[PDB]
Design an enzyme around this catalytic site. Sequence first.
Site, PDB file in Angstrom:
ATOM      1  N   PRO A   1      33.216  -9.936  -4.995  1.00 34.60           N
ATOM      2  CA  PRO A   1      33.629  -8.823  -4.130  1.00 34.60           C
ATOM      3  C   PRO A   1      34.978  -9.107  -3.488  1.00 34.60           C
ATOM      4  O   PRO A   1      35.230 -10.210  -2.999  1.00 34.60           O
ATOM      5  CB  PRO A   1      32.512  -8.749  -3.084  1.00 34.60           C
ATOM      6  CG  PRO A   1      31.896 -10.109  -3.079  1.00 34.60           C
ATOM      7  CD  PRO A   1      32.025 -10.633  -4.478  1.00 34.60           C
ATOM      8  N   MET A   2      35.849  -8.096  -3.477  1.00 32.65           N
ATOM      9  CA  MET A   2      37.202  -8.284  -2.951  1.00 32.65           C
ATOM     10  C   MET A   2      37.704  -6.993  -2.317  1.00 32.65           C
ATOM     11  O   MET A   2      37.948  -6.006  -3.017  1.00 32.65           O
ATOM     12  CB  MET A   2      38.155  -8.758  -4.045  1.00 32.65           C
ATOM     13  CG  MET A   2      38.133 -10.262  -4.265  1.00 32.65           C
ATOM     14  SD  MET A   2      39.153 -10.756  -5.657  1.00 32.65           S
ATOM     15  CE  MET A   2      38.668  -9.545  -6.883  1.00 32.65           C
TER      16      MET A   2
ATOM     17  N   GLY B   1      33.644  -5.025  -0.253  1.00 33.33           N
ATOM     18  CA  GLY B   1      32.835  -4.755   0.920  1.00 33.33           C
ATOM     19  C   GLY B   1      32.908  -3.300   1.333  1.00 33.33           C
ATOM     20  O   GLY B   1      33.996  -2.721   1.421  1.00 33.33           O
TER      21      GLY B   1
ATOM     22  N   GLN C   1      28.458  -4.167  -2.397  1.00 32.13           N
ATOM     23  CA  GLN C   1      28.338  -5.054  -1.243  1.00 32.13           C
ATOM     24  C   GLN C   1      28.404  -4.242   0.047  1.00 32.13           C
ATOM     25  O   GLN C   1      29.387  -3.535   0.293  1.00 32.13           O
ATOM     26  CB  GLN C   1      29.439  -6.119  -1.255  1.00 32.13           C
ATOM     27  CG  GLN C   1      29.335  -7.135  -0.102  1.00 32.13           C
ATOM     28  CD  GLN C   1      30.492  -8.132  -0.043  1.00 32.13           C
ATOM     29  OE1 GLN C   1      31.648  -7.753   0.149  1.00 32.13           O
ATOM     30  NE2 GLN C   1      30.177  -9.416  -0.194  1.00 32.13           N
TER      31      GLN C   1
ATOM     32  N   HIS D   1      26.401  -8.748   2.757  1.00 30.09           N
ATOM     33  CA  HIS D   1      27.516  -9.616   3.134  1.00 30.09           C
ATOM     34  C   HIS D   1      27.160 -10.298   4.449  1.00 30.09           C
ATOM     35  O   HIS D   1      27.299  -9.712   5.526  1.00 30.09           O
ATOM     36  CB  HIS D   1      28.807  -8.813   3.244  1.00 30.09           C
ATOM     37  CG  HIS D   1      30.040  -9.653   3.385  1.00 30.09           C
ATOM     38  ND1 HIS D   1      30.003 -10.986   3.732  1.00 30.09           N
ATOM     39  CD2 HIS D   1      31.349  -9.345   3.221  1.00 30.09           C
ATOM     40  CE1 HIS D   1      31.234 -11.463   3.778  1.00 30.09           C
ATOM     41  NE2 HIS D   1      32.070 -10.487   3.473  1.00 30.09           N
TER      42      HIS D   1
ATOM     43  N   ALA E   1      28.511 -13.444   5.351  1.00 27.61           N
ATOM     44  CA  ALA E   1      29.396 -14.595   5.259  1.00 27.61           C
ATOM     45  C   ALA E   1      30.729 -14.296   5.936  1.00 27.61           C
ATOM     46  O   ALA E   1      30.977 -13.190   6.426  1.00 27.61           O
ATOM     47  CB  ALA E   1      29.627 -15.003   3.799  1.00 27.61           C
ATOM     48  N   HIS E   2      31.575 -15.329   5.975  1.00 27.33           N
ATOM     49  CA  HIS E   2      32.986 -15.235   6.359  1.00 27.33           C
ATOM     50  C   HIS E   2      33.177 -14.711   7.779  1.00 27.33           C
ATOM     51  O   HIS E   2      34.129 -13.982   8.062  1.00 27.33           O
ATOM     52  CB  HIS E   2      33.773 -14.385   5.358  1.00 27.33           C
ATOM     53  CG  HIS E   2      33.601 -14.821   3.934  1.00 27.33           C
ATOM     54  ND1 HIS E   2      33.727 -13.956   2.869  1.00 27.33           N
ATOM     55  CD2 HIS E   2      33.301 -16.030   3.401  1.00 27.33           C
ATOM     56  CE1 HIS E   2      33.521 -14.613   1.741  1.00 27.33           C
ATOM     57  NE2 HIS E   2      33.258 -15.873   2.036  1.00 27.33           N
TER      58      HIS E   2
ATOM     59  N   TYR F   1      31.644 -12.559   9.764  1.00 26.15           N
ATOM     60  CA  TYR F   1      31.409 -11.176  10.149  1.00 26.15           C
ATOM     61  C   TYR F   1      30.069 -11.074  10.880  1.00 26.15           C
ATOM     62  O   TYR F   1      29.490 -12.084  11.290  1.00 26.15           O
ATOM     63  CB  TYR F   1      31.523 -10.275   8.924  1.00 26.15           C
ATOM     64  CG  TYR F   1      32.916 -10.323   8.334  1.00 26.15           C
ATOM     65  CD1 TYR F   1      34.006  -9.850   9.053  1.00 26.15           C
ATOM     66  CD2 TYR F   1      33.145 -10.863   7.076  1.00 26.15           C
ATOM     67  CE1 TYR F   1      35.283  -9.899   8.531  1.00 26.15           C
ATOM     68  CE2 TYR F   1      34.419 -10.918   6.543  1.00 26.15           C
ATOM     69  CZ  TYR F   1      35.484 -10.435   7.276  1.00 26.15           C
ATOM     70  OH  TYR F   1      36.756 -10.482   6.754  1.00 26.15           O
TER      71      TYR F   1
ATOM     72  N   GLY G   1      37.527 -14.688  -8.003  1.00 28.20           N
ATOM     73  CA  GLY G   1      38.207 -13.833  -7.051  1.00 28.20           C
ATOM     74  C   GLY G   1      39.651 -13.530  -7.400  1.00 28.20           C
ATOM     75  O   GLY G   1      39.935 -12.591  -8.151  1.00 28.20           O
TER      76      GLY G   1
HETATM   77  C1  LIG Z   1      41.976 -10.220  -1.347  1.00 34.85           C
HETATM   78  C2  LIG Z   1      40.578 -10.752  -1.209  1.00 34.85           C
HETATM   79  C3  LIG Z   1      39.573  -9.944  -0.688  1.00 34.85           C
HETATM   80  C4  LIG Z   1      38.276 -10.431  -0.558  1.00 34.85           C
HETATM   81  N1  LIG Z   1      37.291  -9.614  -0.036  1.00 34.85           N
HETATM   82  C5  LIG Z   1      35.998 -10.071   0.096  1.00 34.85           C
HETATM   83  C6  LIG Z   1      35.000  -9.247   0.613  1.00 34.85           C
HETATM   84  O1  LIG Z   1      35.250  -8.094   0.961  1.00 34.85           O
HETATM   85  N2  LIG Z   1      33.715  -9.729   0.743  1.00 34.85           N
HETATM   86  C7  LIG Z   1      33.421 -11.023   0.360  1.00 34.85           C
HETATM   87  O2  LIG Z   1      32.275 -11.455   0.478  1.00 34.85           O
HETATM   88  N3  LIG Z   1      34.408 -11.838  -0.154  1.00 34.85           N
HETATM   89  C8  LIG Z   1      35.697 -11.371  -0.284  1.00 34.85           C
HETATM   90  N4  LIG Z   1      36.674 -12.196  -0.803  1.00 34.85           N
HETATM   91  C9  LIG Z   1      36.296 -13.588  -1.215  1.00 34.85           C
HETATM   92  C10 LIG Z   1      36.022 -13.572  -2.720  1.00 34.85           C
HETATM   93  O3  LIG Z   1      34.917 -12.726  -2.976  1.00 34.85           O
HETATM   94  C11 LIG Z   1      35.763 -14.969  -3.283  1.00 34.85           C
HETATM   95  O4  LIG Z   1      34.609 -15.491  -2.666  1.00 34.85           O
HETATM   96  C12 LIG Z   1      36.949 -15.909  -3.048  1.00 34.85           C
HETATM   97  O5  LIG Z   1      38.156 -15.185  -3.142  1.00 34.85           O
HETATM   98  C13 LIG Z   1      37.042 -17.031  -4.080  1.00 34.85           C
HETATM   99  O6  LIG Z   1      37.951 -16.575  -5.056  1.00 34.85           O
HETATM  100  P1  LIG Z   1      38.512 -17.531  -6.220  1.00 34.85           P
HETATM  101  O7  LIG Z   1      37.377 -17.860  -7.156  1.00 34.85           O
HETATM  102  O8  LIG Z   1      39.594 -16.809  -6.994  1.00 34.85           O
HETATM  103  O9  LIG Z   1      39.077 -18.791  -5.599  1.00 34.85           O
HETATM  104  C14 LIG Z   1      37.973 -11.731  -0.946  1.00 34.85           C
HETATM  105  C15 LIG Z   1      38.984 -12.542  -1.464  1.00 34.85           C
HETATM  106  C16 LIG Z   1      40.281 -12.054  -1.597  1.00 34.85           C
HETATM  107  C17 LIG Z   1      41.363 -12.929  -2.161  1.00 34.85           C
END
Ligand SMILES: Cc1cc2nc3c(=O)[nH]c(=O)nc-3n(C[C@H](O)[C@H](O)[C@H](O)COP(=O)(O)O)c2cc1C
Lengths: 373, 376
Positions: free
Chosen positions: B22-23, B55, B97, B176, B178-179, B181, B333
Amino acid sequence: NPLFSPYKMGKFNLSHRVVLAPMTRCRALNNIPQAALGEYYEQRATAGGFLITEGTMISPTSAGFPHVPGIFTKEQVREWKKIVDVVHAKGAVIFCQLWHVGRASHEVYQPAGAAPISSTEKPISNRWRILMPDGTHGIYPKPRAIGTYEISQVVEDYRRSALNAIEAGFDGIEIHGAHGYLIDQFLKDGINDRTDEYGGSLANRCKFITQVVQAVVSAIGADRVGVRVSPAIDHLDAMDSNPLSLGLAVVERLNKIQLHSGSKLAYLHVTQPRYVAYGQTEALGSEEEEARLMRTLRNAYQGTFICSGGYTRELGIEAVAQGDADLVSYGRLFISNPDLVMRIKLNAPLNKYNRKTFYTQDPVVGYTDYPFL
Amino acid sequence: NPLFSPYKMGKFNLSHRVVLAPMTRCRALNNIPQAALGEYYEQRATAGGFLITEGTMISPTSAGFPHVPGIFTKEQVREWKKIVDVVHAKGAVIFCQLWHVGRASHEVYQPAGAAPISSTEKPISNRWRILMPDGTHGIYPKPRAIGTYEISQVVEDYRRSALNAIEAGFDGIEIHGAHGYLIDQFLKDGINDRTDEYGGSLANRCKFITQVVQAVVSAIGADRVGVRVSPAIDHLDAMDSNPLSLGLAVVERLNKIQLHSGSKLAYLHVTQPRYVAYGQTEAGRLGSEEEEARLMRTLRNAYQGTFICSGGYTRELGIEAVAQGDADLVSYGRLFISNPDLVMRIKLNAPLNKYNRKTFYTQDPVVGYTDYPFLQ
Ligand SMILES: Cc1cc2nc3c(=O)[nH]c(=O)nc-3n(C[C@H](O)[C@H](O)[C@H](O)COP(=O)(O)O)c2cc1C
Ligand SMILES: Cc1cc2nc3c(=O)[nH]c(=O)nc-3n(C[C@H](O)[C@H](O)[C@H](O)COP(=O)(O)O)c2cc1C
């Protein structure tokens, strides 16, 4: 090109404005500088250029990294002399940074497994790990709070190391009071929680660096003393509730020391955080706020200002052109470019750096094996 | 190549283990899923592949980024439907998500400029700044601590959003948690300090996420529910004094829910921090690479079901994660941003296009969003 205009740093006539930023490289075997460092600095030495060495130990209990050079023993003075003479053969000015890690240490780096010293007993949290000699990363132990007498002894260690640096042939020293180390542990209110004259208020939190600066100035003269701080960087859990007021308080104290001593310090060195668009997992700030903070500190300080942190050729040119700083010191770029001075002049492409070889104790690969233009 | 051995995720027969993480991308203008999202996911859907959407809002309060899609209104459901059908037309599995930012918001992102909700009144410190609609960065305001009844309201928002996602045709949802929130603001003891039954002990700090997961399970079935947590990530001042204990306590509740419900969840999704050699000025977090790897396997061994690992994974790391048994699926990601055909590129060990961080979180439907090239 602004970066290659003559500049007068006191009694030194610098041909350009690019500076080798102080960078720990872990090539000084058994805390003694080796022949690799001499060739390392000679490659980046230029006629009229300014160089700053890696963080150098001031006492047996000041190491937080493996195989970092010291300047607190007579043997280390002799080894540094051969490095300074090699640099001076290229017509360059070199300063030696005095470094005490404070609580950011470990049992393996302390004599007889003694506890690291700091401003308080609060250690570094699990968010940070310390690089170990075997290549792994360990836990930061609990530091021991130091009293008034032990503070005066650490200041004495700074004074003796500065004298040794001058005896080694250095043109000056740089006080490392940034990046969450011993001095920075007294400045940041997130770490300083003492109930004595060294804590509890903004003025009291700056008392430690004032005594450090005053003692070294009283030993070798203000013109051979440099100060490096970073109020906006929270490395190793060293955040501050108001980086602006903390920076101004430090800058005001330095001006008071200069007026009291009737002399100008060599320069003021400040590193700044730089932010990009991160993901949630990567893990961040306002670039405009950071740029404004650098300008405010530069305007407040009376003397040469040096900026560092995320600067490039174009970024450095703008900083000098707009008057935001007098000198720019480069870090990771200098690792991969021994001739970074001439590469910027000719706008030549820059070699990439390898993070896996920043540290480690190989005299050749990742340290001096990089090629020239 | 273990990444391309088939894996059975419940009822779904996945042909490979490369997952779209998710991104947030900030292209759903005014919280409405645009046609650009459908193009974005279509380029990245594969036969037998699993995708997880950005998300998605569950209520008007859950906003903390500009132009993030919602699924709390029927209008958003029908817009989401066209995206799902396009993804399903290429034989892919897609989850939505559900995302509530909690205190990681601003008045400009809240109705009537209301204070954001959280488990505590403590704001996010000055070490973090929030991206603004005009491209600048502001300060995080003081949140408002919610009571027991308001916690049930938020849980109800999760349940209604889960129902709408199924109504839109989504194969399932991911919670979600994590991170840093809202859910992580209840989990982390560096944030949660409530004196009631939602704070204090490990049991109380896991109570909120348990209610959210249980409600959506009772709504759409445990087989269509996934959970994402980040016990070892300190994003937005969200640190726990014992991340490993927190992760185990969370896994314990998930196992109990599955036994109570009589069915397993879709998967457990965990994101780990990644560390390299930094300088002193960069101030990047430096931990133990081995320690994080051992934490992930411990969560994997404790949990009964599918495990999805994320964070700094590459082709080699993803291959070894599956081969060693450390994970069943690997979600990518940043690499998936610049490589629409990332699954094909990993299969052939092809060069990967670099990603432009400047076009992260921008609003253009094409530039930096769907214009990354394919293999020739
Ligand atoms: C621009 C961006 C937006 C992201 N948005 C979310 C998100 O909305 N929800 C979430 O759980 N993780 C989000 N992530 C984290 C990614 O889902 C992932 O866990 C993390 O980027 C690892 O990426 P990689 O395998 O390329 O290193 C985001 C990451 C990036 C770079
Ligand atoms: C490997 C490495 C070691 C460093 N060691 C020190 C140090 O010991 N003391 C210090 O004040 N700064 C240290 N720095 C920070 C540099 O002085 C400089 O601020 C940093 O490299 C950022 O500049 P850059 O953008 O050119 O990389 C180090 C940086 C690096 C990359």
